[PDB]
Design a protein around this nucleic acid. Structure first.
Lengths: 144, 106, 112
RNA sequence: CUGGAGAACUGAGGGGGGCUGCUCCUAGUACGAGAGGACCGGAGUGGACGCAUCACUGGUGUUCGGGUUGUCAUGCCAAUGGCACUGCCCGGUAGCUAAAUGCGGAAGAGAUAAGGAAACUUGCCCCGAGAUGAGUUCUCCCUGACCCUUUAAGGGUCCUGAAGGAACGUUGAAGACGACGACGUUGAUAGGCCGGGUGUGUAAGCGCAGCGAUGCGUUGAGCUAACCGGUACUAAUGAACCGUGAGG
RNA sequence: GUCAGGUAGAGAAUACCAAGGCGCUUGAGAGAACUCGGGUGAAGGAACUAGGCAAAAUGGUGCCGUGCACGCUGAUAUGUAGG
């Protein structure tokens, strides 16, 4: 996701929680790594959009192979042998609904305040590294 | 625009209009174990910070012996109502010099 | 960490800005020309609309009656339809004295 | 199992780390002849050190704005500007700093010693192929001619300049050794012109009364830099250089 | 050693000007890895050190307290005691 400023939310009881507000477009998978080829399980995902004239076709061909629209940058995360993903699958922010602690890259064990899909938005209690408009990686807290 | 859209619904439009140097009464919720009480605070506004959802104002109260300053968050749920008693006729944005007033009749 | 003294810097731009208006073109170092823009166009924008207060404020800057007369009379109307970008910078090699990058800075006019 | 580029991963090894104390439930329990009264595990509340670090809480801010003393210039009064440490004092919207706020140490697994512990080896966080089994996985570009000829990774001539990258120019909050984030005309990164918000808190000019020093109407208005929301009628344009043409 | 104007001020200090004398014999852009020197910056104002040293604070006089007045006075008086 992309960091978009910071604000606070007031609760009904009265306390105010300072929240880092992160915008997370739909993340669309581009490549799936497996034991047979890469020796490990991971999925490569992209986000955003890039100008056609500026995206070099070595990546465009790589994107076109998966039917994926050219995004900005590429990231991939290792799997936990408990989930499966297919090339071209679109991943939205609702996956964070069931998890209360998240890791933002690293500042770890941050409470999640609110998640919505209609506006592709995620909320984190605290501060995260980087200025506004920077790229952030949000994953569930490992220290359970 | 993402930030602004997020705070518009959180802000409250029932904010009364007051100016620095005005005598203000503000009601604040109080929690004592399991009860909600309304506490009334009397004082004079000596500073207002306008930032939208983060807008706040400082009120100085001359207590029994010494003054007490209190910074209220305008849009916080803790504050319930704000009422103006006197229309102070000052010509300064921040009245910090009262640490060490006329009436506007307008 | 950035993420002449102030008085000298302010006076120099005030003088150079007046000379630019008077002559419509001047030869100066490229960094000076770039920084001069942030002082020059704001004058022309103010001159687009004429008022007693604007005339006085325009005088408070450049402290010259000739320039104010030059403004509000033809620089105003000549740039009324133009939304910014009243200045043009042309690089003209380097100064022989100290190899400084020099450039002509000239208002978009003189199309006779 | 050595052709020439732009990305995403596997992580051996190495470096920074194994905070402390108290209360409550477990419990008028274990041990002991009574009183006194657990330890561990779990949860919660402070302080110290380090990373991240600004929506909200303070301070600072030599450019903008309000007020003012002595003197001077702009042929004048009023209205300004420059100098006297930023003339002196009182504040603030962006960037930089913490007192405040927020996160991390704990738990689990194989191997302990003494007689199955906070130390070692891990898990968590940051960095990592000048770590030679020699570029894994994915993707983009390339099938061009004659002589000499001791006939073989030999030399010379002619034709060609892809993918990708660098320079110059508009930006540089990565903290000046700079090949780095993006954008460079199907083009809003910066320097302007507008609108909105904040700060400053009643300007210039005009009018009534007092015919003075103030205040009111005009007017919650005028002004406002690095920022927010729009607009290319200005300028980053169009030719080179560098890197090749089927891989022992 | 002498001659050294106007305003402000007790003065021969200091600041601001006229006349006169000058820009001092390398410059244009970019910002600080804090080598140096000032103003300002929360305060349990001594948590530093042998010594609160050097800074800062401070200084005055439309004065009755062993706290008050201070930049301007429609008017008293369109200049009051008086040389």
């Amino acid at each position: 996701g992309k960091k978009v400023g910071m604000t606070r939310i007031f609760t009904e009881d009265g306390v105010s929680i300072p929240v880092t507000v992160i915008e997370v477009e739909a993340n669309r998978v581009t490549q799936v790594k497996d034991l047979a080829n890469d020796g490990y399980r991971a999925i490569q995902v992209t986000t955003g959009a890039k100008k056609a004239n500026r995206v070099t076709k070595p990546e465009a061909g790589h994107f076109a192979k998966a039917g994926v629209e050219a995004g900005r940058g590429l990231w991939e995360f290792r799997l936990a042998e408990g989930e499966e993903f297919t090339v071209g699958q679109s991943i939205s922010v609702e996956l964070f609904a069931d998890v209360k602690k998240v890791d933002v890259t690293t500042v770890q064990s941050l409470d999640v305040v609110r998640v919505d899909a209609e506006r592709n938005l995620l909320l984190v209690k605290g501060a995260v590294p980087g200025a506004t408009g920077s790229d952030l990686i949000v994953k569930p807290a490992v220290k359970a | 625009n993402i930030i602004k859209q997020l705070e518009q619904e959180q802000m409250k439009q029932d904010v009364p209009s007051f100016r620095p140097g005005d005598t203000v009464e503000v009601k604040v919720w109080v929690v004592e174990g399991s009860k909600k009480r309304l506490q009334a605070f009397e004082g004079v506004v000596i500073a207002i910070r306008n930032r939208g959802l983060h807008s706040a104002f400082t009120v100085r109260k001359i207590s029994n012996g010494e003054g007490v300053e209190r910074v209220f968050q305008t849009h916080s749920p803790v504050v319930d109502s704000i009422s103006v008693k006197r229309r102070g006729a000052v010509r300064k944005a921040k009245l910090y010099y009262l640490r060490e007033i006329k009436e506007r009749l307008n | 960490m950035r993420h002449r003294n102030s008085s000298h810097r302010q006076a120099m731009f005030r003088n150079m800005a007046g000379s630019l208006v008077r002559h419509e073109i001047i030869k100066t170092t490229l960094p000076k020309a770039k920084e001069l823009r942030r002082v020059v166009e704001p004058l022309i924008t103010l001159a687009k609309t004429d008022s007693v207060a604007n005339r006085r404020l325009a005088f408070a800057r450049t402290r010259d009656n000739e320039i104010v007369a030059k403004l509000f009379n033809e620089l105003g109307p000549r740039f009324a339809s133009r939304a910014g970008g009243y200045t043009r910078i042309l690089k003209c090699g380097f100064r022989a004295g100290d190899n400084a990058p020099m450039a002509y800075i000239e208002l978009v006019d003189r199309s006779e």
